[PDB]
Design a protein around this nucleic acid. Structure first.
Length: 117
RNA sequence: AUUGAAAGUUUUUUUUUUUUUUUUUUUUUUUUUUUUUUUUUUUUUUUU
């Protein structure tokens, strides 16, 4: 049973500073949406450039999916995002689990790892 | 001193989950640092 969000045993908070190595370009969801800058401007929170939490979550989920598929284990699988027939874990008689579904949630299950901006 | 009255429509329930504004796009193509100007003029290898 992977739906244990009702009972919270432990909570860990990771606080740090992210420093870009190369020329980091913000997602710029403001596609052809100028606010106070030239051409298409990167998104920012009150004139302060902001890395979207959704972007980091998507990149992390892609990395986790790649890792899980590289595991090549029957017990652990990844289901397509558009599929609505996927389930997080199966308690059929030892069971199957979805690591990205466990971490960042699915339609059937909410996330367990929250990522801030 | 209404036939005659005194009662809260109240408790209880998070509008929540799934989703990277993403891929592609070499600030390059052309243009001789050349061009007119004499390292020239003056001076006895020489006297008591």
């Amino acid at each position: 049973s992977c739906m244990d969000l009702d009972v919270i045993t432990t909570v860990v908070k990771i606080e740090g500073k992210l420093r870009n190595e190369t020329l980091l370009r913000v997602g710029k969801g403001k596609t052809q949406d100028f606010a106070e800058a030239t051409d298409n401007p990167i998104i920012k929170y009150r004139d302060r450039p902001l890395i979207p939490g959704s972007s980091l979550k998507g990149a992390f989920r892609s990395l986790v999916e790649s890792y899980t598929k590289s595991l090549n284990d029957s017990k652990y699988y990844v289901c397509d995002l558009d599929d609505n027939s996927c389930v997080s874990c199966e308690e059929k008689k030892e069971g199957r689990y979805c690591i990205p579904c466990i971490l960042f949630g699915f339609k059937d299950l909410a996330s367990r790892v929250y990522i801030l901006d």
